[PDB]
């Protein structure tokens, strides 16, 4: 068996020419990826407010620590009764720093906040007990 | 076109065996006798010469044996025909057809991804990667934009043969706009 080179006439006929043929793959797809995660939840604020203008918008004035946000935004909304966004938000503002600036005072926490909110019962008291914890030139 | 033309295929076995043999009688000026293929065939950084096979190189058996020696004493192992070139090389017809329905797929890709207001990524689009006439590798350039503003490049390619006396081999295509319209790698 010598090494020399021979011709490929007559010897094709099991083969196709695209038989072997193998395509690559994107080189670092996932490395990528997490860029662009990284810079389309930094980009949030910018295209949040991409089209709103300091001039001619209404609303203008009025991530996961935004979901107890809105669920605050949602206990309130249901004890308080569907009042725009900024009654809302403010309310937010309201509670949370309300029941985070208490130094850690918890019976005196009744007559304030669910005389604001109404007095529905204290089932909601210590519904309301989890918001204030899950808060935090 | 090659597989076609038995005169190329004997006319490439012949320039490999030249090649070859130059390769020899630089080693030693006595021609040999039954000279293992793996001093050409093996890959640079493996050490060998990285040369590629449009002929039929069968390897023996005799050089696919090898030792390897621990404390429990010396272990002997072995492991066919060396790949040719044209088996890894997509035909044209295949190359047109599949750039024909893979452009297709990226147009159809493209005009969701507007619907939904995004980009088209690399995770749609990884199944048409090594794929389409110009490649769709093409579309993930940074340098592409620039691209969209070289037109009659492929007459330039071919003008350059009165401005470079480097002989262009792939004078037809090129890396930049094209795509590599082959995959050596398996």
Request: some cysteine; charged content about 35%.
């Given at each position: ?137 | ?53 449009m002929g039929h190189v069968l390897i023996p058996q005799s050089d696919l044996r090898w030792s390897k020696q ?97 002989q262009n081999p792939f004078w037809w295509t090129h890396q930049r706009h094209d795509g590599k319209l082959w995959?050596?790698?398996?």
């Open positions: 068996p010598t090494g020399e080179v021979l011709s490929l006439v007559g010897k094709l006929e099991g083969t196709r020419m695209g038989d072997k043929a193998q395509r690559t793959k994107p080189q670092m797809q996932e490395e990528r990826r997490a860029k662009r995660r990284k810079r389309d939840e930094d980009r949030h604020d910018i295209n949040k407010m991409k089209g709103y203008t300091l001039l001619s918008e209404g609303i203008d004035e009025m991530k996961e620590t935004r979901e107890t946000y809105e669920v605050l935004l949602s206990f309130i909304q249901a004890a308080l009764g569907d009042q725009p966004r900024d009654i809302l938000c403010g309310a937010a503002d309201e509670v949370l720093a309300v029941l985070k600036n208490e130094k850690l005072r918890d019976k005196e926490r009744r007559k304030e906040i669910d005389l604001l909110l109404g007095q529905t019962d204290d089932t909601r008291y210590h519904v309301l007990v989890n918001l204030g914890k899950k808060i935090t030139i | 076109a090659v597989v076609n033309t038995q005169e190329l295929l004997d006319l490439l076995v012949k320039c490999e065996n030249k090649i070859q043999t130059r390769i020899k009688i630089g080693l030693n000026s006595k021609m040999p006798s039954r000279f293992p293929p793996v001093v050409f065939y093996t890959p640079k950084e493996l050490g060998g010469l990285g040369m590629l096979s621990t404390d429990v004493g010396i272990t002997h192992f072995r492991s066919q025909l060396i790949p040719n070139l044209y088996r890894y090389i997509q035909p044209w017809e295949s190359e047109f057809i599949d750039s024909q329905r893979v452009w297709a797929e990226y147009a159809l890709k493209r005009q969701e991804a507007i619907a939904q207001n995004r980009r088209l990524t690399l995770e749609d689009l990884e199944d048409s990667w090594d794929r389409g006439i110009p490649r769709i590798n093409t579309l993930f350039q940074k340098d592409r934009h620039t691209l969209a503003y070289d037109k009659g490049w492929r007459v330039r390619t071919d003008f350059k043969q009165y401005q470079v006396l480097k995959n050596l790698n398996n």
